[PDB]
Design a binder for this molecule. Structure first.
Ligand SMILES: *[C@@H]1O[C@H](CO)[C@@H](O)[C@H](O)[C@H]1NC(C)=O
Ligand SMILES: *[C@@H]1O[C@H](CO)[C@@H](O)[C@H](O)[C@H]1NC(C)=O
Ligand SMILES: *[C@@H]1O[C@H](CO)[C@@H](O)[C@H](O)[C@H]1NC(C)=O
Ligand SMILES: *[C@@H]1O[C@H](CO)[C@@H](O)[C@H](O)[C@H]1NC(C)=O
Ligand SMILES: *[C@@H]1O[C@H](CO)[C@@H](O)[C@H](O)[C@H]1NC(C)=O
Ligand SMILES: *[C@@H]1O[C@H](CO)[C@@H](O)[C@H](O)[C@H]1NC(C)=O
Ligand SMILES: *[C@@H]1O[C@H](CO)[C@@H](O)[C@H](O)[C@H]1NC(C)=O
Ligand SMILES: *[C@@H]1O[C@H](CO)[C@@H](O)[C@H](O)[C@H]1NC(C)=O
Lengths: 338, 338, 338, 338
């Protein structure tokens, strides 16, 4: 049965641990893959962890030999249980309630091609349009009403690039618009469904200490801006969750360095520029080194609830480190020091 | 289909071997986890072995990095086939006939939080109430009428602590009472269903050479006392099985040391203080070293019987050793020397 | 659906390779168990290989620590994919069309107990009756009409022992007779169903260069004698297949040594003492060393045929060697030199 | 549900990557089999990779000990997840929509026998007819209307051999014709279904720099000739795809050496001898070394389409190298340099 995604995002007062991936103590003598920036996506039956690898084992990069593989959430990414998904140096994935959609980018940095697979079968492709490193989300893609959306970027990492939003049905591209977003930069977008709309929070690698966002409907009509908590432009992939005018911001404790990770609830942060917030919870302590982060969601079809549960993953730098994921609850929680 | 648990416990005249877990001869060159105190719980389809580990392999502790994992009963606890359940330094688990319920305690010894998962999804949480090492059963939780109960302790290991009984439905806490049990100590409780009631036998680490018990109904009304075989207070986790006024006691042969393991049937031991018994069977010989023990059960939905079959596991110290489990029969059996 | 077993055994003019088990070239660096005398039994869905092991890996005996494990036919017997069945130093197994029946013998040589499991659950037991090494078939048990039979021996390996035939339904012993067979010896019996009867060919370790057999019905009425091809008494486990008065005999080429293996069709060999035969096929060459052999069958429920297909396994000594299995066809075949 | 195969082959304007098999970087410390010339075949649910091996692991040939094994496409061919199919030094396989058909050749070079299995059961056999190295396709067999066809060769590799086409239903040979094809040589035939006909393109190892083909119906009526792109005779296994009078030819870039791999669309190449073509795409660059190649297809029952999708695999020499497979699309693609 196809995912609906017409319900609202669940109100969460706190965040609690879900799983720990990329364990390295097991890797000391065990056959385990050397992976970086794993991402999590969920089906109606189970959650899975996706990663890119060249097959390099520990105790033993745009590459045509680099592939996307996956294991059940919390499992060890070993060559003996990882499933093969696609060939890609940049990739994203999601489940539409029927099967898995996998989007992978392979080929030369001057003529890259994205190969779209549905249930293991190649269904479509999309070739570079500005000929300069085609790249995708490196996260879960959002699905609403059996269709799964995504945001792709082609162009310079330090300048004005072209951005395109794609609606994909059963592996095929049915609609696609080009964004008019001058002076915005949208790399590594973290997207989630909310009441039959798609909301994405992206990484500005050009001139934005704050994070840009794009919001769009199934027809691909869109709005843009920055999280005001300046509303204009003022990096590492991140995320946030919209609740009316309030926003849950995932960020480091330090500004100049990668230290700590905390989740702040700013009830007027979507539209206001004030620094006020109501509550805060420590996810990662100041001594640890925080790194890449992104969101994923658990749909009603999986949780048995009448709303969508917001979750997220933080990769701790330590080097590779570990990818710890957490999920949102409305019950009591404490700060966490890993 | 949800488990009923309304039938009585099966009368057993003897105990016969079921499986051997934590094998170490296989571990000499094989990638196997270093585990301690594994516990067994059964679903309607299969029995599984649960353990806590940091990912340390052999031939290579309250920790936020310590996790709960599981393998099919009798299988090798390797990184290539263990399933991930939760993040916890103390944990329990059971199946309600529909899905798995996993209860894990993580966080700081001064503010621990128990995370309750149902079918892999976080459904609820319960924060420490006396702020002193929240800890659970380290065994199977009991289920009756689709609801699964448990007993949690918060407080000193050598003094008067607070004890709370929790009724959990589909991962959520629907009811919870605090026990009034002055001069009792209830750690590591081993619980089983019997005719729509829950009976638990616990470890008194304070001032009880005998074992305290608590018995309660679905509504959480309860009675307490000691196994009289003194009825008041006179350690290592253990178990016993109630049959009217008779009790099957799992204990060591020696008193001052951990030597041997035997099962004694005292037909008046629940309420009497006499040392008389009718029958006895050796499970483990005097030379071997016995250690932690606990019970688990096999429901009619799994066995095809019209009663609940009592089983149990003994960890042999040897160090880690091996966790051998046995099940109750009404057929001929012999003593066992491992 | 339960197996019927009311059809006749399929007429075979030849034998063709099925699978190769116990590979050792893979074991040179791979984690593989050290096993001896593996046996094959089939379910309606798949065939599986069973073996006993202490967990000893290569490149690293009546024992309470020795267990019975299994892998899909042709698969490598590694600790990462072997399933646990039971604890035993002597064992047999078969499928009744619904679930697996496993019979394992454990305990002391002076008071051994056989533990009968059905679908992983202990259902019954049978204690030694002459107190001298209880031992079973080390092969597949036969099933006819949802019930599975077996032949067990208790007594000296070089003298007159007691033999008992057991009919088992869903793991429980419903009927059991003691054989009156003076001057016969029946160890390691290889049994198969044929038209709602059970036929077993056993190893005489006392005073029979030929092989004794027992034939019995569901009610356990029986006949005994030797394969005449003397009809009375004149070792290593073996087998034969009855077709009217003709018999297919699996034997070595040499008499005084373990060299070669051949299958001979003697159309009057069941009842005649003549040395005449019609056809012969080489399975194993003279240079190789043959060893233990036994039979198993593939039922109509698995093959899609209107008869039961006779198969067999030969362990080549080489030491452990390899266990090669073959199946009967009515099509052209050649001799085989491994 | 049985495969129909009555639809036409899908028109493809380009070829895009599907999977990478035989990875060796993983093999540096991992337990992985040493394999050569793996082939791909697809079922209605999944695609699988087949290979022959003696069990030799890396970091550790007609042989009765050599077997055919398989893993999911893109998975590592390790001893811990490879499935056993048959015993053979030459083999082919395909799925008929119900189960797997496996054809393996074993036995002596002077009296080889092909063993046909269906769903793991031996169903039939075919003995050598010219007594000189019986050999099969080393690829996927074609299936149309629940029946699966194949082409087998018996005779010299440098002269006139006998060729026979076999129609197999549920593992049994129902029809078989001998080809009259003087001065033709047909080894390692790559076959695919197209509109209820079977088309095969073979390797002429005798005196043909071009490739011979045979085309036949379910009744086994056939036509022969060469791909004209001379129509008569003018090596390494290869393939081509027929689209009316046009042909998609898989070949190396160099003539005298194994360098590069490209796919050329010659709209009149089936029947014309001209060197003209409309389009060309690079699969493998000139520096790399190309080697064995063959075709396989993805049926409507798997893809959800109303036509059959043509795919193919190229083994890159590097030694073993890697087996990269591609599939046909009608969307934009680029050249590939591995
Ligand atoms: C989503 O759509 C389903 C019908 O497919 C409906 O039953 C459900 O109530 C809708 N939920 C919301 C929040 O609109
Ligand atoms: C969802 O898609 C269906 C067609 O499958 C359409 O009829 C319906 O209007 C859509 N609903 C929304 C909320 O877009
Ligand atoms: C338990 O409840 C079921 C109904 O769900 C009933 O059929 C069964 O007899 C009851 N067993 C006992 C011991 O009360
Ligand atoms: C079991 O729960 C059901 C509701 O699901 C309730 O109606 C019934 O009375 C309960 N029975 C017992 C024995 O508690
Ligand atoms: C075996 O019994 C079944 C009924 O369960 C019957 O249909 C079949 O014909 C019988 N076969 C023989 C050989 O008697
Ligand atoms: C098989 O068992 C059934 C009962 O399940 C019985 O009615 C029938 O007579 C038996 N048939 C044979 C051939 O023993
Ligand atoms: C193939 O046969 C099926 C019936 O089994 C039919 O529905 C389908 O249209 C046919 N396709 C072609 C191309 O003839
Ligand atoms: C396919 O086989 C069926 C019988 O299963 C037959 O009736 C039909 O005519 C065949 N069709 C073709 C296209 O050969």
């Amino acid at each position: 049965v196809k995912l609906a995604g017409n319900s609202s995002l669940c109100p969460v007062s706190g965040w609690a641990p879900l799983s720990k991936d990329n364990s390295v103590r097991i890797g000391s003598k065990g056959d385990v893959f050397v992976i970086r920036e794993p991402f999590i996506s969920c089906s109606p039956l189970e959650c899975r962890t996706f990663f890119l690898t060249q097959g390099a084992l520990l105790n033993d990069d745009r590459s045509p030999y680099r592939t996307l593989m996956s294991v059940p959430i919390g499992s060890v990414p070993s060559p003996y249980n990882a499933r093969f998904e696609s060939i890609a140096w940049s990739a994203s994935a999601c489940h539409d309630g029927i099967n898995w959609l996998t989007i992978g980018i392979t080929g030369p940095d001057n003529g890259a091609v994205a190969i779209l697979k549905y249930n293991g079968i190649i269904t479509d492709t999309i070739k570079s349009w500005r000929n300069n490193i085609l790249r995708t989300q490196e996260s879960e893609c959002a699905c609403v009403n059996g269709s799964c959306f995504t945001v792709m970027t082609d162009g310079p990492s330090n300048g004005q690039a072209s951005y395109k939003i794609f609606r994909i049905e059963k592996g095929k591209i049915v609609k696609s618009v080009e964004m008019n977003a001058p002076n915005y930069h949208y790399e590594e977008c973290s997207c989630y469904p909310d009441s039959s709309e798609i909301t994405c929070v992206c990484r500005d690698n050009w001139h934005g200490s704050n994070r840009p966002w794009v919001s769009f409907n199934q027809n691909l009509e869109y709005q843009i801006g920055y999280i005001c908590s300046s509303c204009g432009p003022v990096g590492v992939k991140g995320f946030s969750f919209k609740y009316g005018n309030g926003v849950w911001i995932g960020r480091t404790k330090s500004i100049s360095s990668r230290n700590g990770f905390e989740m702040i609830w700013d009830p007027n942060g979507w539209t206001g520029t004030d620094n006020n917030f109501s509550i805060k919870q420590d996810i990662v302590g100041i001594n640890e080194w925080s790194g890449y982060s992104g969101s994923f969601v658990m749909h009603p079809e999986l949780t048995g609830l009448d709303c969508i549960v917001p979750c997220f993953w933080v990769e701790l730098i330590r080097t590779s480190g570990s990818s710890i994921s957490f999920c949102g609850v409305n019950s009591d929680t404490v700060g966490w020091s890993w």
